[PDB]
Amino acid sequence: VLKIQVHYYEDGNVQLVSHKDVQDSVTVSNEAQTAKEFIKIIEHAENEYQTAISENYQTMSDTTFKALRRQLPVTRTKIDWNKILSYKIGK
Amino acid sequence: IANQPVVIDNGSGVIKAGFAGDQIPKYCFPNYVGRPKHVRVMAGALEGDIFIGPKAEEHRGLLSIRYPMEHGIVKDWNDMERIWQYVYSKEQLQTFSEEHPVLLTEAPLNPRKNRERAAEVFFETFNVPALFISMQAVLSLYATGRTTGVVLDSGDGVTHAVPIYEGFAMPHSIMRIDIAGRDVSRFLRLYLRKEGYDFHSSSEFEIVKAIKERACYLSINPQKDETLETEKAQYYLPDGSTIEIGPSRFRAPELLFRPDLIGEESEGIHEVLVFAIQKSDMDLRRTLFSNIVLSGGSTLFKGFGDRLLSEVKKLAPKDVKIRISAPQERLYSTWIGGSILASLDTFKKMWVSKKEYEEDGARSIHRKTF
Amino acid sequence: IANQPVVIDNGSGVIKAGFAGDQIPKYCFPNYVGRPKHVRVMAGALEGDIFIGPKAEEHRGLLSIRYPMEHGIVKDWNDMERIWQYVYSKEQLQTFSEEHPVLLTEAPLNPRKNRERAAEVFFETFNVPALFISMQAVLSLYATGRTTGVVLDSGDGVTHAVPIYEGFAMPHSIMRIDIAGRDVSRFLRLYLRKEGYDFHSSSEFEIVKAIKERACYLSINPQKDETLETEKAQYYLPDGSTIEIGPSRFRAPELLFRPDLIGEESEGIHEVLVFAIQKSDMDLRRTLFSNIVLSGGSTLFKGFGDRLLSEVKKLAPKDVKIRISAPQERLYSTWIGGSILASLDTFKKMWVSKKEYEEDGARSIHRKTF
Ligand SMILES: Nc1ncnc2c1ncn2[C@@H]1O[C@H](COP(=O)(O)OP(=O)(O)O)[C@@H](O)[C@H]1O
Ligand SMILES: Nc1ncnc2c1ncn2[C@@H]1O[C@H](COP(=O)(O)OP(=O)(O)O)[C@@H](O)[C@H]1O
């Protein structure tokens, strides 16, 4: 299991919390090979992890955090308050 | 003073008029001012010397016709004042401009000076109690009953695609061209000269429009029709002489899809419809593709919708459900929605009153429209 | 093979070129490929049919201009290859690509596929001995003579605020938008249609850029300018007809600060500048505020720097010394830095040699840049 944690507390908090559980099957051969095989598994996993942890969040969080609340509305126009207070919808 | 308001749906080719809450515009006539070419020697002649509506349609040959409107933008303001005065006069409506509030229409992304000068005419020359200007795409959706969807339109002046989502007309995704029915009729006239039969006079121009209305179809594959040889179908003029039209009938409405023919690098109808959907947001695209509404007279060509479907299939992303709906009364779709908008009680809030115009001016008209 | 290296400063709007260790770029021309709209009937016409640089600027009206590069991301690769070939050809440089090493530039945080395909073009199609891609902000600081400071820039494609402190370009604190001069020119074009004067053609598009360059100013208080009525100043087009510009001139460059007006979510130039300073470490913020360098053509608006200073005063913490410095030649700031970087003896170590590229591939290019 592979857990990250980051915490920022200036002007309010932000936290990164994470983990990856991995189950793998390896075959023993030599001391030089088993030393360089497990490390290789860790190296690729932790890079793929950091890669996903960095590259998915910079883009996908921006879009999923946006799917919850969008940066501008569905019109892409700042909502008009005068319009809201003197318009009717429906049938 | 809250009388039954008048809905004047302005158009470059045809102008529609009538009262609020009706099923159809009772008063539809072409938007031009015919004036006599020849000299009047004999007494008991046609009096006035300024012809609008059915008199002008009856006596085309006498009148040097000239359109005040071009691409949804009035050039001749004195002529539009005479048309609006004729609309309210006893020959059509039989009412006063002083009593009823006015619903007006215009194309999107037009000159703001023309919108101000329109308001000046309705408030000062006519004595209107309250005015309101609106879009064509918003009204067409009110007529159908829907809220969401794209509205492709093709009148005589403008072709513009406006995407709307749940009663929110998206301003930044409004696509527009100055290629439309009048330009197709002008392109047909130029093609008929290449065939043989020329129509140079302004009264004689409406024969080309009548040929365009009747005998023009949009072929699905243009390259296949170009390789094949046409049949040369006939058409009888108002005189009686025959005209073998030939390949000009099918190459004429190609202008709307291929604007490179007239000599004007524009997008075209099908590209405008795709561009309007693409400029709008990712979440709304699939709903906008499913709800595509057609209106205007230049959508009434044979196999227009079938060609517009094929062009969307070519451009748009694959495996998406396309649906180009079209009402029965496409010519009057914009007026029906205005009549519905006028009949609703909320119309009182939206309009610009005469008192509010006198206090503020043009700024209040710009605020209330958007 | 260590000959005098060439510095090709890329850009969506304009592309600069010349030799290393020079004061000014001798070879500046706009980055586009003009192609003939009209039919060449007469013998002894313009030969070639693919126009780049001053010939295209001279013969705008004939050519359908199209840009290969939008937002620092090339769309059409064949067009950029023709532009780079025109740069190296006898009409501009009068040199071979085989002799001189190459210094390329790109906007930060771009797609890596385009950077790879750029390198492929320089190593394979041209036979370059050594290539090196670099940042624009790093070069602009080398041109000025500082090491510390933020570099706000605004070309035709990209706007990006890169903070650097004593030769440490922080890759993480780099902010970027896809909003710049081209989008301001497109937004001004849209406003001119709202005013009345429509420009749709590709050759006619460069008149809007010329109007944007000449007749524009950024107001300090936009709400105060909105309440007041404008003067409506004039400007003569290349033809001769006069145009009253009106309120479009001052509302057009507001796009850079308010990105919501075009219809796309972004931070803005002033926010990006504050944001680049905030993302860096706490101890280095006050030095980054003191050294703010401007660059690019879209920073040349009247009262642009004054508006940037006011926006920083509003957002940033109080009682901090703000200083937005700028060079005299803001257009050629990045190229001078590249010419300085190329003239240095260190330059031999940084580059990607042709032998190293043939052995490793794209991975060696990704390693050497960062
Ligand atoms: N059946 C038809 N086939 C082809 N074109 C038509 C047909 N009916 C009308 N038109 C064209 O469309 C125009 C009418 O468009 P209209 O719906 O009134 O739009 P607008 O209100 O914007 O003028 C006419 O001038 C005519 O040239
Ligand atoms: N004096 C000026 N005022 C306003 N805008 C300008 C001015 N000069 C150039 N521009 C705009 O800036 C662009 C040039 O910027 P530039 O830095 O050369 O772009 P790039 O960084 O892509 O090379 C032009 O396309 C033009 O629209």
GROMACS .gro file of N, CA, C and O in nm, chain B residues 136-187:
model
  208
  227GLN      N    1  -3.554   3.657  -3.342
  227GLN     CA    2  -3.635   3.565  -3.423
  227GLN      C    3  -3.628   3.421  -3.370
  227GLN      O    4  -3.729   3.350  -3.371
  228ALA      N    5  -3.509   3.380  -3.326
  228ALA     CA    6  -3.486   3.244  -3.274
  228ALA      C    7  -3.559   3.215  -3.143
  228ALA      O    8  -3.607   3.103  -3.122
  229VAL      N    9  -3.568   3.315  -3.055
  229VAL     CA   10  -3.638   3.301  -2.927
  229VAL      C   11  -3.788   3.283  -2.950
  229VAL      O   12  -3.851   3.198  -2.886
  230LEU      N   13  -3.844   3.361  -3.042
  230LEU     CA   14  -3.987   3.354  -3.076
  230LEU      C   15  -4.025   3.220  -3.141
  230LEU      O   16  -4.126   3.161  -3.104
  231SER      N   17  -3.943   3.172  -3.235
  231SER     CA   18  -3.968   3.044  -3.302
  231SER      C   19  -3.979   2.925  -3.205
  231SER      O   20  -4.061   2.836  -3.226
  232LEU      N   21  -3.896   2.926  -3.100
  232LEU     CA   22  -3.905   2.824  -2.994
  232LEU      C   23  -4.030   2.839  -2.907
  232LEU      O   24  -4.087   2.739  -2.863
  233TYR      N   25  -4.072   2.963  -2.881
  233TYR     CA   26  -4.201   2.990  -2.814
  233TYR      C   27  -4.321   2.940  -2.896
  233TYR      O   28  -4.420   2.895  -2.839
  234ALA      N   29  -4.311   2.950  -3.029
  234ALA     CA   30  -4.416   2.902  -3.120
  234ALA      C   31  -4.430   2.750  -3.119
  234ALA      O   32  -4.541   2.697  -3.115
  235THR      N   33  -4.316   2.680  -3.125
  235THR     CA   34  -4.314   2.533  -3.120
  235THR      C   35  -4.355   2.479  -2.983
  235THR      O   36  -4.422   2.376  -2.975
  236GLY      N   37  -4.314   2.549  -2.877
  236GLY     CA   38  -4.342   2.508  -2.738
  236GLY      C   39  -4.218   2.466  -2.660
  236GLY      O   40  -4.225   2.452  -2.538
  237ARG      N   41  -4.106   2.446  -2.730
  237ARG     CA   42  -3.981   2.403  -2.666
  237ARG      C   43  -3.909   2.519  -2.598
  237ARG      O   44  -3.943   2.636  -2.619
  238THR      N   45  -3.810   2.484  -2.517
  238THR     CA   46  -3.720   2.580  -2.452
  238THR      C   47  -3.577   2.564  -2.504
  238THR      O   48  -3.516   2.661  -2.551
  239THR      N   49  -3.524   2.442  -2.495
  239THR     CA   50  -3.391   2.409  -2.546
  239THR      C   51  -3.389   2.397  -2.698
  239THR      O   52  -3.494   2.385  -2.762
  240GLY      N   53  -3.269   2.402  -2.756
  240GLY     CA   54  -3.247   2.371  -2.898
  240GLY      C   55  -3.190   2.484  -2.981
  240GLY      O   56  -3.200   2.602  -2.944
  241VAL      N   57  -3.131   2.447  -3.095
  241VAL     CA   58  -3.079   2.543  -3.193
  241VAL      C   59  -3.191   2.582  -3.288
  241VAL      O   60  -3.279   2.500  -3.319
  242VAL      N   61  -3.189   2.707  -3.334
  242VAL     CA   62  -3.281   2.756  -3.435
  242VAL      C   63  -3.202   2.805  -3.556
  242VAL      O   64  -3.149   2.917  -3.556
  243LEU      N   65  -3.194   2.721  -3.659
  243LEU     CA   66  -3.145   2.763  -3.789
  243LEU      C   67  -3.261   2.834  -3.860
  243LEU      O   68  -3.373   2.783  -3.862
  244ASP      N   69  -3.233   2.953  -3.914
  244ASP     CA   70  -3.331   3.026  -3.995
  244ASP      C   71  -3.269   3.070  -4.127
  244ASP      O   72  -3.147   3.082  -4.138
  245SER      N   73  -3.354   3.091  -4.227
  245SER     CA   74  -3.310   3.135  -4.359
  245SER      C   75  -3.420   3.217  -4.426
  245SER      O   76  -3.503   3.164  -4.500
  246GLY      N   77  -3.421   3.347  -4.397
  246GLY     CA   78  -3.516   3.441  -4.456
  246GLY      C   79  -3.468   3.490  -4.592
  246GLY      O   80  -3.398   3.419  -4.664
  247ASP      N   81  -3.507   3.613  -4.626
  247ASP     CA   82  -3.463   3.678  -4.750
  247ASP      C   83  -3.331   3.754  -4.730
  247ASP      O   84  -3.255   3.771  -4.826
  248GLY      N   85  -3.305   3.799  -4.607
  248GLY     CA   86  -3.187   3.880  -4.575
  248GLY      C   87  -3.076   3.805  -4.503
  248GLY      O   88  -2.962   3.805  -4.550
  249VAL      N   89  -3.110   3.741  -4.391
  249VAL     CA   90  -3.011   3.682  -4.300
  249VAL      C   91  -3.033   3.532  -4.279
  249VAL      O   92  -3.146   3.485  -4.273
  250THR      N   93  -2.921   3.459  -4.271
  250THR     CA   94  -2.918   3.323  -4.218
  250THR      C   95  -2.837   3.326  -4.089
  250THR      O   96  -2.717   3.355  -4.093
  251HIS      N   97  -2.901   3.299  -3.975
  251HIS     CA   98  -2.833   3.299  -3.845
  251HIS      C   99  -2.878   3.183  -3.755
  251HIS      O  100  -2.998   3.155  -3.745
  252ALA      N  101  -2.781   3.118  -3.690
  252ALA     CA  102  -2.807   3.007  -3.599
  252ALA      C  103  -2.783   3.052  -3.454
  252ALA      O  104  -2.671   3.093  -3.420
  253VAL      N  105  -2.887   3.044  -3.372
  253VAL     CA  106  -2.881   3.083  -3.230
  253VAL      C  107  -2.915   2.962  -3.143
  253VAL      O  108  -3.027   2.911  -3.151
  254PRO      N  109  -2.819   2.915  -3.060
  254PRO     CA  110  -2.848   2.807  -2.966
  254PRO      C  111  -2.910   2.859  -2.836
  254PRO      O  112  -2.857   2.953  -2.777
  255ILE      N  113  -3.020   2.797  -2.793
  255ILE     CA  114  -3.092   2.834  -2.671
  255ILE      C  115  -3.101   2.709  -2.582
  255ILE      O  116  -3.119   2.598  -2.632
  256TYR      N  117  -3.088   2.729  -2.450
  256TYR     CA  118  -3.093   2.620  -2.352
  256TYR      C  119  -3.176   2.660  -2.229
  256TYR      O  120  -3.128   2.731  -2.141
  257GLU      N  121  -3.302   2.615  -2.227
  257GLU     CA  122  -3.395   2.633  -2.114
  257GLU      C  123  -3.431   2.780  -2.089
  257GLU      O  124  -3.433   2.827  -1.975
  258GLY      N  125  -3.462   2.851  -2.198
  258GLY     CA  126  -3.495   2.993  -2.191
  258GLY      C  127  -3.375   3.083  -2.165
  258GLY      O  128  -3.386   3.181  -2.092
  259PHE      N  129  -3.261   3.047  -2.224
  259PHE     CA  130  -3.138   3.128  -2.216
  259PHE      C  131  -3.072   3.133  -2.354
  259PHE      O  132  -2.995   3.043  -2.390
  260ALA      N  133  -3.106   3.236  -2.431
  260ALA     CA  134  -3.049   3.257  -2.564
  260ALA      C  135  -2.901   3.293  -2.551
  260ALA      O  136  -2.868   3.400  -2.499
  261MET      N  137  -2.814   3.204  -2.599
  261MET     CA  138  -2.670   3.220  -2.583
  261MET      C  139  -2.619   3.325  -2.681
  261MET      O  140  -2.623   3.303  -2.802
  262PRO      N  141  -2.571   3.441  -2.630
  262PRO     CA  142  -2.530   3.549  -2.720
  262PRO      C  143  -2.396   3.527  -2.791
  262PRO      O  144  -2.381   3.566  -2.907
  263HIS      N  145  -2.300   3.464  -2.722
  263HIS     CA  146  -2.164   3.446  -2.775
  263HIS      C  147  -2.150   3.331  -2.877
  263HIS      O  148  -2.046   3.322  -2.943
  264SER      N  149  -2.252   3.246  -2.889
  264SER     CA  150  -2.255   3.140  -2.990
  264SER      C  151  -2.347   3.172  -3.109
  264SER      O  152  -2.383   3.082  -3.185
  265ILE      N  153  -2.383   3.300  -3.127
  265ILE     CA  154  -2.465   3.343  -3.241
  265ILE      C  155  -2.378   3.352  -3.366
  265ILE      O  156  -2.292   3.440  -3.376
  266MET      N  157  -2.401   3.260  -3.460
  266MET     CA  158  -2.340   3.266  -3.593
  266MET      C  159  -2.435   3.337  -3.689
  266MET      O  160  -2.557   3.333  -3.670
  267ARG      N  161  -2.379   3.401  -3.791
  267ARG     CA  162  -2.456   3.484  -3.884
  267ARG      C  163  -2.384   3.502  -4.018
  267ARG      O  164  -2.261   3.512  -4.022
  268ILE      N  165  -2.462   3.506  -4.126
  268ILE     CA  166  -2.413   3.538  -4.261
  268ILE      C  167  -2.509   3.636  -4.326
  268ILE      O  168  -2.628   3.641  -4.290
  269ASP      N  169  -2.459   3.714  -4.422
  269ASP     CA  170  -2.543   3.796  -4.510
  269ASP      C  171  -2.564   3.725  -4.646
  269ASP      O  172  -2.558   3.788  -4.752
  270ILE      N  173  -2.589   3.594  -4.641
  270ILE     CA  174  -2.624   3.513  -4.758
  270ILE      C  175  -2.760   3.449  -4.728
  270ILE      O  176  -2.777   3.383  -4.625
  271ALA      N  177  -2.858   3.473  -4.816
  271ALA     CA  178  -2.997   3.436  -4.789
  271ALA      C  179  -3.081   3.438  -4.917
  271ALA      O  180  -3.027   3.458  -5.026
  272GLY      N  181  -3.213   3.418  -4.903
  272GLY     CA  182  -3.307   3.413  -5.015
  272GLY      C  183  -3.291   3.516  -5.126
  272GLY      O  184  -3.303   3.481  -5.244
  273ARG      N  185  -3.265   3.641  -5.090
  273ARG     CA  186  -3.244   3.748  -5.188
  273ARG      C  187  -3.116   3.727  -5.268
  273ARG      O  188  -3.113   3.754  -5.389
  274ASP      N  189  -3.011   3.680  -5.201
  274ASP     CA  190  -2.883   3.650  -5.266
  274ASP      C  191  -2.895   3.525  -5.355
  274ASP      O  192  -2.828   3.517  -5.459
  275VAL      N  193  -2.979   3.429  -5.316
  275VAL     CA  194  -3.008   3.311  -5.398
  275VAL      C  195  -3.089   3.350  -5.523
  275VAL      O  196  -3.062   3.301  -5.632
  276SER      N  197  -3.187   3.439  -5.505
  276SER     CA  198  -3.265   3.494  -5.617
  276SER      C  199  -3.179   3.578  -5.712
  276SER      O  200  -3.197   3.573  -5.833
  277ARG      N  201  -3.086   3.655  -5.655
  277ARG     CA  202  -2.989   3.733  -5.734
  277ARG      C  203  -2.890   3.642  -5.808
  277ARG      O  204  -2.852   3.672  -5.922
  278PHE      N  205  -2.850   3.532  -5.744
  278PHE     CA  206  -2.763   3.431  -5.806
  278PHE      C  207  -2.835   3.351  -5.915
  278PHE      O  208  -2.773   3.310  -6.013
   0.00000   0.00000   0.00000
